[PDB]
Design a protein around this nucleic acid. Structure first.
Ligand SMILES: [Mg+2]
Length: 863
RNA sequence: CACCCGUGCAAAAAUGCAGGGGUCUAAAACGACCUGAAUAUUUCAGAUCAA
């Protein structure tokens, strides 16, 4: 399944002039040089400790055999022969868009006869892609509830507040909209950016810097998503030119987590440090703290080259720590067991690790990789056994009371040089994305930073290569941001420590308790006068608050609820849970082992029988079922009573209602996140082809103005009077549409599109108006087979409700008509408005055709 | 079981075999991370969360 070349230690194969070079795997993403090649003449490089020897060489292929771990012998192809097999016969390749020179011409100053510079640039374009996604999901959480879109840094608050007294209609409404923003309750969900702790309490920031926050991410969107022809295209890459109003707020928010961690570190982590001093009698306590700091905070147990937990999961599988006795003590155990291994492999077992890394690289099946983890595990279990049970028997409740109530004094002399830098040292770029992440979910943060560290590390490893070979590495004066890529990399690794750890929660307000019951269900006949009394009994205007805690612990403190209110609007959500099919599609994707865990709690005999009873249990759910919570809140969930058995029964139902509906809204906005990428790349590629001598035109009026110019076709009077021919395909403007089949099919689809529906298709995906109004659009559908179908029903029904009183054509009305007969998405209508990116073909196919969309749920092509 | 490319065979414009691709997609290898229903600087529960 996996490539034999990269198991033998081959990393890449570069082309320079007539010469050909070759690389190999080093430390992580470091690049080690190996044999160069000139027409069957190979000079070896790195004579000391080579990874693989090439045994046979020729013009069209390079054989190899590896020296590390599992010996693998493989084959490798020549770049210079690419596109030259059966037809000058040796020349550098070019990208499938035929756009290599203009990119080299822009970042760097000149064209090169290499392929090393272009592998670099396609990683720079991949961070603007990922930055173009999450900046859009951020603004939507603010915009959900024109102001946000036209927004820049040259308008400081002293200049913006002048528009209060303005006589103009726009400037007056622009400011009056700002006051309507800060005068909203929903900012409590964004407390990390909008609140500060200061008798003492937690309140909003000064009104000056709230503007500075949203102004700063508001241009991030308008920059990433657009081309920005002018001198503002270098905004993100020139952040040292900002006003002082923006730099200061970044420092204020970047320094509040570190001061929560490293101000007092010994006292809140006082338990684990004591429980370790017991096993490592011989070690000096001061350096142990240094290790436990850089283990826990900096996560240096996640850059080792292998996975510590997969070893952990295999060694203590059936050793008796999976009981319910070890539930609260569990994370205390895994934090330490992962440390005992980390200090093992760092100092004494360093050689046993390098063997593991060079083994997993040279593994061609997953059954091999899974075995070696289980091989090394039994060695670890017989070695680290008494130290483990010496930990578990120390975590027995009462012992933690004594260890938390105890006096200790330890020198921070060693530790204070491993601390995290404050905001005064790090750059504005790393501080910017931190601010951004505080408008996002959990799984979205990791995908952002984890993607960026790889793309900078990949950018690094090419720059050192081109130093070793004597090439022009100097960026142009405007893209000098990347010459310090070694710096911005490490800043992001520090950021991956505490971006996910610290979250500052607010004491719940009244309005949250209304959103908590609206999402959960309110009876029909109840009026506005009555619901404000329902919570008046919750908040007790003797005082019993057992119900206030139920609605705060099981609902508000859930990471699920914190997501649904950001991207949703809670009353739209309960109205959406009345779609039994979609709700049932989310249940039958869950394993039956989870279902039998939920069911046995919520019931007091097959899978699909249980799965129906959980559906209709969701469709009937109300706050009034939980108004009796004052009686059983105080009960402990683990005891054996009636209140406890009732309590967990009432808990899991909420945990199921929210968990199910977290998944639906998550997959749909992630599916939405792949089309914003597509319209980014359309305005990206348009300026590039236009610079290459081609003539496209304007695109904000017609999004199909590019892919026609790629073909060489046009419309004369609103439509295409040109027919199919092969002179166009062979004479296309990129390597994709040189083929005559997909040239033809896109032309067929493209002649039945229209200009108006496409320009609306952008404003529906880039603004997320499709799931902003989800219940209106998802009223009735027969079935749900995948999240691709569902999203493509909504965005079609959003266009029916938009094009209901307007002019349309025969092709559009025939598609909308097939949307009413069959209550689902018209497959031939997906690929009409999804035409504007046909100049890229494998993108067009993956987004228009199920089975090719998601790499985890594969299918079949159309043919 | 998607796209492109090199090779060997049968061909005569395209098909079988065996492989490669960071320069093809959300998408190179280990790893991190996601799919995922499974939060982590803090043992749990309870209590403390709008006047
Ligand atoms: Mg790529």
């Amino acid at each position: 399944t996996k490539s034999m070349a990269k198991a033998a230690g081959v990393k890449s194969v570069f082309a320079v002039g007539n010469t050909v070079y070759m690389t190999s795997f080093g430390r992580g993403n470091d690049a080690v040089l190996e044999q160069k090649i000139v027409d069957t003449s190979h000079e070896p490089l790195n004579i000391d400790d080579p990874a693989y020897q090439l045994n046979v060489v020729t013009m069209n292929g390079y054989s190899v055999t590896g020296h590390r771990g599992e010996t693998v012998s493989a084959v490798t192809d020549n770049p210079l022969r690419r596109f030259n097999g059966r037809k000058p016969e040796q020349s550098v390749p070019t990208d499938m868009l035929c756009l290599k020179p203009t990119l080299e011409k822009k970042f760097f100053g000149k064209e090169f006869d290499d392929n090393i510079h272009i592998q670099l640039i396609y990683n720079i374009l991949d961070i603007e892609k990922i930055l173009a996604v999450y900046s859009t999901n951020a603004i939507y959480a603010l915009n959900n509830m024109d102001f946000f879109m036209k927004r820049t840094t040259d308008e400081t608050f002293d200049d913006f507040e002048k528009k209060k007294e303005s006589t103009n209609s726009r400037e007056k409404a622009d400011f009056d909209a700002f006051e309507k923003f800060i005068g909203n309750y929903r900012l409590a969900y964004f407390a990390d950016a909008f609140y500060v702790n200061k008798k003492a309490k937690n309140v909003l920031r000064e009104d000056k810097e709230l503007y500075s926050v949203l102004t700063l991410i508001g241009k991030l969107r308008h920059w990433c998503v657009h081309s920005e022809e002018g001198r503002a295209e270098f905004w993100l890459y020139k952040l040292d030119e900002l006003k002082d109003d923006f730099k200061n707020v970044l420092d204020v928010v970047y320094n509040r987590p570190v001061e929560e961690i490293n101000n007092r570190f010994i006292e809140n982590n006082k338990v684990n440090i004591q429980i370790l001093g017991s096993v490592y009698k011989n070690t000096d306590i001061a350096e142990l703290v240094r290790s436990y700091y850089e283990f826990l905070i900096t996560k240096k147990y996640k850059n080792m080259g292998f996975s510590i937990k997969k070893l952990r999961e295999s060694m203590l599988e059936g050793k008796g720590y999976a009981d319910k006795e070890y539930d609260s003590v569990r994370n205390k155990l895994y934090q330490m067991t992962d440390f005992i291994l980390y200090t093992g492999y760092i100092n004494e077992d360093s050689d046993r690790a390098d063997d593991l890394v060079n083994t997993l690289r040279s593994s061609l099946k997953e059954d091999d990789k899974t075995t070696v983890y289980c091989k090394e595990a039994d060695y670890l279990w017989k070695k680290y056994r008494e130290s483990i049970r010496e930990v578990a028997d120390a975590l027995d409740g009462d012992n933690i009371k004594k260890l938390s109530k105890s006096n200790i004094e330890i020198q921070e002399d060693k530790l204070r040089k491993c601390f995290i830098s404050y905001a005064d040292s790090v750059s504005e770029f790393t501080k910017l994305i931190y601010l951004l992440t505080r408008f996002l979910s959990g799984k979205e943060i990791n995908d952002l930073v984890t993607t960026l560290i790889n793309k900078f590390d990949n950018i690094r490893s090419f720059l050192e290569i081109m130093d070793e070979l004597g090439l022009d590495r100097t960026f142009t004066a405007e893209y000098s941001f990347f010459e310090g890529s070694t710096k911005y990399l490490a800043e992001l690794v520090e950021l991956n420590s505490f971006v996910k750890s610290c979250s500052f929660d607010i004491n719940a307000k009244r309005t949250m308790y209304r959103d908590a019951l609206d999402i959960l269900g309110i009876e029909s006949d109840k009026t506005e006068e009555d619901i404000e009394k329902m919570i008046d009994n919750i908040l007790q205007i003797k005082k019993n608050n057992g119900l206030r805690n139920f609605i705060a612990s099981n609902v508000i403190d859930s990471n699920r609820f914190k997501y649904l209110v950001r991207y949703g609007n809670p009353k739209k959500i309960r109205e959406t849970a009345k779609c039994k099919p979609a709700v049932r599609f989310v249940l039958n994707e869950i394993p039956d082992a989870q279902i039998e865990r939920y069911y046995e709690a919520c019931c007091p005999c097959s899978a699909n029988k249980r799965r129906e009873k959980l559906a209709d249990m969701i469709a009937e759910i109300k706050f009034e079922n939980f108004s009796d919570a004052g009686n059983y809140q105080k009960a402990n969930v683990t005891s054996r009573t009636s209140e406890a058995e009732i309590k967990r029964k009432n808990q899991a139902i909420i945990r199921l209602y929210l968990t199910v509906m977290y998944i639906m809204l998550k997959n749909l906005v992630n599916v939405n996140a792949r089309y914003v990428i597509a319209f980014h790349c359309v305005e990206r590629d348009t300026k590039l082809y236009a610079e290459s001598g081609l003539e496209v035109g304007n695109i904000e009026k017609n999004k199909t103005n590019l892919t026609m110019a790629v073909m060489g076709v046009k419309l004369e009077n609103g439509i295409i009077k040109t027919e199919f021919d092969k002179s166009f395909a062979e004479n296309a403007a990129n390597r994709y549409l040189r083929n005559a089949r997909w040239y033809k099919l896109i032309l067929d689809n493209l002649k039945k599109s229209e200009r108006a529906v496409v320009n609306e298709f952008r404003n529906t995906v880039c603004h997320l108006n499709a799931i902003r109004n989800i219940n209106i659009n998802i009223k009735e559908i027969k079935e749900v087979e995948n999240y691709f179908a569902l999203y493509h029903y909504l965005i079609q029904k959003h266009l029916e409700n938009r094009f209901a009183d307007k002019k349309v054509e025969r092709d559009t009305g025939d598609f909308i008509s097939k949307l009413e007969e069959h209550k689902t998405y018209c497959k031939d209508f997906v690929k009409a408005y999804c035409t504007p990116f046909g100049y890229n073909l494998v993108r067009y196919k993956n987004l228009t055709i199920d089975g090719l969309f998601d790499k985890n749920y594969p299918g079949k092509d159309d043919s």
